[PDB]
Each structure stands twice: as C-alpha cells, then as structure tokens.
Amino acid sequence: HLCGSHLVEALYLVCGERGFFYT
Amino acid sequence: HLCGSHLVEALYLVCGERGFFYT
Amino acid sequence: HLCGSHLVEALYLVCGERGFFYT
Amino acid sequence: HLCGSHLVEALYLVCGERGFFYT
Amino acid sequence: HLCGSHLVEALYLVCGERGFFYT
Amino acid sequence: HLCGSHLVEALYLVCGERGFFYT
Amino acid sequence: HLCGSHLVEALYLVCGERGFFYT
Amino acid sequence: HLCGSHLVEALYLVCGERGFFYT
Amino acid sequence: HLCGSHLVEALYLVC
Amino acid sequence: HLCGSHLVEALYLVC
Amino acid sequence: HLCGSHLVEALYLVC
Amino acid sequence: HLCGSHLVEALYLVC
Amino acid sequence: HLCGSHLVEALYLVC
Amino acid sequence: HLCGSHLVEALYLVC
Amino acid sequence: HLCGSHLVEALYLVC
Amino acid sequence: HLCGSHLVEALYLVC
Amino acid sequence: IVEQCCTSICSLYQLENYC
Amino acid sequence: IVEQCCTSICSLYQLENYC
Amino acid sequence: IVEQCCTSICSLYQLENYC
Amino acid sequence: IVEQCCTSICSLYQLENYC
Amino acid sequence: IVEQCCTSICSLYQLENYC
Amino acid sequence: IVEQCCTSICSLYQLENYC
Amino acid sequence: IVEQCCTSICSLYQLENYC
Amino acid sequence: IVEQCCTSICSLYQLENYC
Amino acid sequence: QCCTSICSLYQLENYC
Amino acid sequence: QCCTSICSLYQLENYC
Amino acid sequence: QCCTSICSLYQLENYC
Amino acid sequence: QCCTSICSLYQLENYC
Amino acid sequence: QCCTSICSLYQLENYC
Amino acid sequence: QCCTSICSLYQLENYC
Amino acid sequence: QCCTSICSLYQLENYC
Amino acid sequence: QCCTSICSLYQLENYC
C-alpha cells in the first residue's frame, strides 16, 4: 500500500490565445 | 496493493489559438 | 493487486488553431 | 490481479487547424 | 487476472485541417 | 503506506491571452 | 506512513493577459 | 509518520494583466 | 533623439 | 533616432 | 533609426 | 532602419 | 532595413 | 532589406 | 532582400 | 531575393 | 505553408465585376 | 506560415465591383 | 507566422465596391 | 508572428465602398 | 508579435465608406 | 509585442465614413 | 510591449465619421 | 511598456465625428 | 506487461 | 509494468 | 511500474 | 514506481 | 517513487 | 520519494 | 522525500 | 525532507 483512493491531479501548460482577434 | 480506486489525472499541453481571427 | 477500479487519465497535446481565420 | 475495472484513458495529440480559413 | 472489464482507451494523433479553405 | 486518500493537485502554467483583441 | 489524507496543492504560474484589449 | 491529513498549499506566481485595456 | 525639427501635425474635426 | 525632420501629418474629418 | 525626413501622411474623411 | 526619407501616404474618403 | 526612400502610397475612396 | 526605393502603390475606388 | 526599387502597383475600381 | 526592380502590376476594374 | 509569391495575384478566391 | 510576398496581391478572398 | 510582405496587398479578405 | 510589411496593405479584413 | 511595418496600412479590420 | 511602425496606420480596427 | 511608432497612427480602434 | 512614439497618434481608442 | 495503456515504447510523435 | 498510462517510454511529441 | 500516469519517460513536448 | 503522476522523467515542455 | 505528483524530473517549461 | 507534489526536479518555468 | 510541496528543486520562474 | 512547503530550492522568481 503506497497511496489511497480518489486521487486527482491536473497539470495545465496553456500558452493561450495569441495574435489578432476581432470577435 | 499500491494505489486505490477512482484515480483521475489530466495533463494539458495547450498552445491555443494563434494568428489572425476575424470571427 | 496494484491499482483499483474506475481509473481515468486524459493527456492533451493541443497546438490549436493557427493561421488566418475569417469566420 | 494488477488493475481494476472500468479504466479509461484518452491521449490527444492534436495539431489543429492551420492555414487560411474563410468560412 | 491482470485487468478488469469495461476498459476503454482512445489515442488520437490528429494533424487536422491545413491549407486554404473557402467554405 | 505512504500517502492517504482523496489527494488533489493542480499545477497551472498559463501564459494567457497575448496580442490584439477587439471583442 | 508518511502523509495523511485529503491533501491539496495548487501551484499557479500565470502570466495573464498582455497586449491590447478593446472589449 | 511525517505529516498529517488535510494539508493544503497554494503558490501563486501571477504577473497579471499588462498592456492596454479598453473594457 | 526621437524626432526632428519643424514637425507639424494638424488635425481638423468639423460638423 | 526614431523620426526625421520636417515631418507632417494632416488629418481632416468633415461632415 | 526608424523613419527618415520630410515624411508626410495626409488623411481626409468627408461626408 | 525601417523606412527612408520623403515618404508619403495620402488617404481620401469621400461621400 | 525594411523599406527605401521616396515611397508613396496613395489611396482614394469616393462615392 | 525587404523593399527598395521610390516604391508606389496607388489604389482608387470610385462609385 | 525581397523586392527591388521603383516598384509600382496601381489598382483602379470604378462604377 | 524574391523579386527584382522596376516591377509593375496595374489592375483596372470598370463598370 | 509558404506563399512565397511576388508581382502577381496569389491565393485569390473571388475577383469579380458585377454590374 | 510564411506569406513572404511582395509587389502583388496575396491571400485575398473577395475583390469585387458590385454596381 | 511571417507576413513578410511589402509594396502590395497581403492577407486581405474583402475589398469591395458596392454601389 | 512577424508582420514585417512595408509600403502596402497587410492583414486587412474589409476594405469597402458602400454607397 | 512584431508589427514592424512602415508607410502602409497594417492589421486593419474594417476600412469602410458607408453613404 | 513590438509595433515598431512609422509613417502609416498600424493596428487599426474600424476606420469608417458613415453618412 | 514597444509601440515605437512615429509619424502615423498606431494602435487605433475606432476612427469614424458619423453624420 | 514603451510608447516611444512621436509626431503621430498612438494608442488612441475612439476618434469620432458624430453629427 | 501493461493494461489499457502504452508501455516499453521508445518514440511517439505526430507531425505537420 | 504499468496500468492505464505510459511507462518505459523515451520520447513523445506533437509538432506543427 | 506506475499506475494511471507516466513513468520512466525521458522527453515530452508539444510544438508549434 | 509512481501512481497517478509523472516520475523518472527528464524533460517536458510545450512550445509556441 | 512518488504519488499523484511529479518526481525525478529535470526540466519542465511552457513557452510562447 | 514525494507525495502529491514535485521533488528531485531541477528547472521549471513558464515563458512569454 | 517531501509531501504536498516542492523539494530538491533548483530553479522555478514564470516570465513575461 | 519537508512537508507542505518548499525545501532544498535555490532560485524562485516571477518576472514581468
């Protein structure tokens, strides 16, 4: 036994919107 | 037994929208 | 027994929209 | 017994739309 | 017994639309 | 036994929106 | 036994919005 | 036994909004 | 140095 | 140095 | 250096 | 260096 | 260097 | 270097 | 280098 | 190098 | 993509004279 | 993408004369 | 992306003369 | 992105003459 | 982003003459 | 971002003549 | 950000003539 | 940020003539 | 000897 | 010997 | 020997 | 030998 | 040998 | 040998 | 050997 | 060997 239950991880590498946007 | 149940992971590598957008 | 049930993983490598868009 | 039931994985390698779009 | 039932996997390698589109 | 249950982690590397936006 | 249950961590590296925005 | 339960950490590196905003 | 000499910028708005 | 001498920029808006 | 001398930019909007 | 000397850009909108 | 000297760009819109 | 000297680009729209 | 000197591009739209 | 000198491209649309 | 094109039209879609 | 294009139209969509 | 373009139109979408 | 463009229009969307 | 552009329009969206 | 641009319009959105 | 721009409009949003 | 800009408009938002 | 995922791989890559 | 994830891999990369 | 995550990897990278 | 996270990795990076 | 987090890594970086 | 956090890392950095 | 935090790291930095 | 905080680090810095 090392780790329990219901473990959650979430790693985000987000270079989001770039450039020109005319919405 | 090492790890439990209902484990969740989510890794995002998101270089999102780039360039010119005229929506 | 190493790991439990209902395990979930989701790895995203998303270089999204690039260029010119005129929607 | 190594792993349980109802396991889910989803790996996305998505270099999405590129170029010129005039929708 | 190694793994359970109802296992799901989905690996996407998607270099989507490229070029010029005039829809 | 090393670690317990219901562990959560979330690492964000977010270079957000850049450029010109005319929403 | 090293660590307990219900542990939480959250590391944010956020270089937020940059550039020109005309919302 | 090294550390207990319900531990929480949160490290923020936030170079927030920069540039010109005309909301 | 950023700008030279004898620079002019005339702006006219009318209605 | 960014700009030269004797630069002109005239803008006219009319209605 | 970014721009030269004796530069002109005239803009006219009329109605 | 980005641009030369004696540059002109005239724009006319009429109605 | 990006552009030369004595460059002109005249644009005319009429109605 | 991207463009030369004495470049001209005249555009005329009429109605 | 991308383009030479004394380049011209005249465009005329009429109605 | 992509294009030479003294290039011309004249376009005329009429109605 | 490389639209390395000079001194002519390239990637046009609809040039038209409607009248 | 490289629109390395000089002294002509490039990537135009709709040039039109409607009248 | 490199719109390294001089002395002509580049990346235009709708040039029009409606009348 | 590098809009290294001189002495002409670049990245325009809608040039129009409506009348 | 580098809008290193001189002596012409660059990154325009809507130039119009409505009348 | 570097809007290193001289002697012309750059990053405009809506130039218009409504009348 | 470097709006190193001289002798023309730069980063404008809405130039208009409404009438 | 460096708005090192001389002898023209820079960072304007709404220049208008409403009438 | 893995279940419902990759193992003993060396290289994987999309391209465009 | 892994479950529902990658192991013993060396290189993985999208590209565009 | 990992569960529901990567292990023994060397390089991983998107690109654009 | 890790669970629900990365281990023994060397390099990881997005790019754009 | 870690749980629900990274270990034995060397480099990690987004970029843009 | 860490839980729910990073360990044995060397470099980590966003960039823009 | 740390829990729910970083250890044995060398460099960490955002940038913009 | 730390809990719920950083240890053995050398450099940490945001930037802008």
Coordinates of C-alpha atoms in Angstrom, one line a residue, chain J:
Chain J
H1 CA 16.8 58.2 -33.5
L2 CA 13.1 57.4 -34.5
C3 CA 12.0 60.0 -37.0
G4 CA 13.5 62.8 -39.1
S5 CA 12.9 66.4 -39.7
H6 CA 10.1 68.4 -41.4
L7 CA 7.6 65.6 -40.8
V8 CA 3.9 66.4 -41.5
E9 CA 0.7 64.5 -40.6
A10 CA -2.5 66.4 -41.5
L11 CA -5.9 64.8 -40.7
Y12 CA -9.2 66.2 -41.8
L13 CA -12.7 64.9 -40.7
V14 CA -15.7 66.8 -42.1
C15 CA -19.5 66.3 -42.1

